[PDB]
Amino acid sequence: MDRIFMTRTEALEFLLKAHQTAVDKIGHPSHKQTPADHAAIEALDRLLLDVRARRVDQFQINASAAQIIVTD
Structure with missing residues (x-):
């Protein structure tokens, strides 16, 4: 179970790491x-x-891959 919670600003890390994937x-x-x-x-x-x-909202592409649930 992989999940990452970040704020609006911290969301950047998700938008960036997501592309790398x-x-x-x-x-x-x-x-x-x-x-x-x-x-x-x-x-x-x-x-x-x-x-x-x-x-922006929270979402996930895969269940095995590193997930990042946005915490508004």
């Missing part, structure tokens, strides 16, 4: 950061606004 799941390389990444920010804007606006 997917990025690692696909088996992507470890090459140096690319310039195109600057555009990827367009997507982060979603979670960034949802968090900064204090409109």
Whole structure:
């Protein structure tokens, strides 16, 4: 049973660690950061606004993987 409770601000750790899981799941390389990444920010804007606006909720992708239940 894996569960992580964090506040609105601490939620960042979850939004960050969450990406690593997917990025690692696909088996992507470890090459140096690319310039195109600057555009990827367009997507982060979603979670960034949802968090900064204090409109985020708790959720989990898998039961075996590290879960992070948001504690509003």
